[model samples]
Target chain A: PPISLDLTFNLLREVLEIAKAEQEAEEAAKNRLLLEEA
Target chain B: LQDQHCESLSLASNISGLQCNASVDLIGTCWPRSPAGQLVVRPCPAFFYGVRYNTTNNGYRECLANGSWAARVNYSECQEILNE
Candidate 1:
């Protein structure tokens, strides 16, 4: 049943937005490219 | 390039899984897209085999993103989403 999946713009957007929002707060998540298997 | 995939579902294997249901089929009950309003996702009811009865099947599914939904719906309806 698991067939197709989008790379998810939301993820990237989230990552970047999170990174930006967190950059001043450490930006630890930004260090990770967030390579998801989803 | 809408980059969105789901967990509990395989990746790499189904990059086109959304596009897998039908080949060469577009804007139909194969690959559905976004919409307007609050967004309504309906698979409705259709003859499963095109000759069966009361076989209203659900779609690959439609979920809201930024307040919109997507689905494996009729091509026209899909195109309508694009138009909106």
Candidate 2:
């Protein structure tokens, strides 16, 4: 997407997007496994 | 389309938005140096969750003497905000 300002921000935004999704998905899977064990 | 091209040309002088000047910034806030050479950014809302939500928070980014900006403490993450 086209918008305004800085090289640094773009890198951060993309990194965060990937990181947050990955963490959530992994956590979700772990919880599912825990529940299955229970 | 020459005018459009010129308008779209990316430069610090013409760009205006609340996005971070660096990746180390806490998601919604920034500290872009102005043409006058000062890091000053206000509270501005930015998108998260794939542009699904936004929050407004005021914070700071330090201009380190080490030729880089110092990252802020308690930096924000979208999932954390959403979960809260």
| Best prediction by lDDT | 2
User: What are the per-residue Cα lDDT tens digits for candidate 1 across B19-62?
Assistant: 32211122222323332322223442343212222224332343
Docking quality tier of model 1 = incorrect
Q: Give a tens-digit lDDT track for model 2, residues B50-84.
A: 43332444433444443445444222322133551
* Candidate 2: C-alpha lDDT: 0.39
Which number leads on DockQ? 2
Off by over 4 Å in 1: A1-38, B1-28, B35-40, B55-60, B64-84
Clashes of each: 15, 1
Quickly count the clashes in candidate 2: 1
* TM-score against truth, every candidate: 0.20, 0.29
> Root-mean-square deviation of each candidate, in angstroms?
21.6, 18.7
| Model 2, position A16: C-alpha lDDT score | 76
lDDT (Cα atoms) of all candidates against the true structure: 0.31, 0.39
TM-score winner among the candidates? 2
